[PDB]
Amino acid sequence: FERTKPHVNVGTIGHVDHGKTTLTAAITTVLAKTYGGRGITINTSHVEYDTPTRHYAHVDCPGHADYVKNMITGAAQMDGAILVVAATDGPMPQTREHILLGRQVGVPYIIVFLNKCDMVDDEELLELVEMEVRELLSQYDFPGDDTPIVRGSALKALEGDAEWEAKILELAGFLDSYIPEPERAIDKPFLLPIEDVFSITVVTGRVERGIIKVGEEVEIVGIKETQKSTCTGVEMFRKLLDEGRAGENVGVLLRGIKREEIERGQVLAKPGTIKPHTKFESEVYILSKDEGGRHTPFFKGYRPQFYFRTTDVTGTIELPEGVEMVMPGDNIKMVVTLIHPIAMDDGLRFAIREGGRTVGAGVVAKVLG
């Protein structure tokens, strides 16, 4: 059964010292007792726990900087987040920044854990904090009014008090009931980032999403004008395949396409499912000097290289209103204009590079054209 069981990626977000680590431990301990069991520096805490129906892979990060970095890069992948808010502080600057980051990076669900309720015996105070959380969530397009808010005490639950452990079970209940099963890679529209191209035209790469089948139509998206072709075959390790599946490195014979019609950065895709774009809004983290990043701020007019899947594409940037420069270590909303179009949807990751050096990482937030 545990083999057939769905896997869900979750994580604790929220202001420093609000109880994310304590809650992460209270979740593992209560569920264990109740049911049983690139050049960027990634600082994380990974734990796994189970409910009768689901398997959860849970990420917790030490500092705010780790959340920014981990959420943007995709190291802290979340199908749903648990926003931890201490009743004693109420929402704080990182509570807001974590919700905003969650929106930009595409965290699709947020459940709230109103923490340190053992410290606050005031119903008016608790409703005031819930009110502020829901307004902050709605502000960032999350359904604030319909979001589950569990009132609890991660510490008292971690200390063994059953009345408070009952709140951890309530939170787990919402992980189960509120976060839907994530859409599997194999069920998403076919997508293959092109690595190598050969004449025999065979295009190779890892099938990122869906399935490619002999006889089906495919689109060559990115760089130049979109080309449609039919798949004439799929090969892997010299053995002919009937179809190519997500996660596999395969080769695809394309009918009537000549080697010169294929460029680097192009993708193979199910017709009409991905479009090329030169302009987009993104959330970007710029590496600190201590992470082997830039030493000085950059200004508008900075023309770095944007690495999308297989190739670098030159681009120009637009900074937010009232933002003159970007310091190493900063994370900002960046509007990018590339020289050649790239096939992209929201949630697409890229590296920002200067030569053969990663100076930043980003995620496409909004595709513009």
Partner: peptide, 12 residues
């Protein structure tokens, strides 16, 4: 194609 144990390659 062209591969055989773990890298990009192909045929068709």
């Amino acid at each position: 194609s062209c591969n055989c144990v773990c890298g990009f390659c192909c045929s068709x």
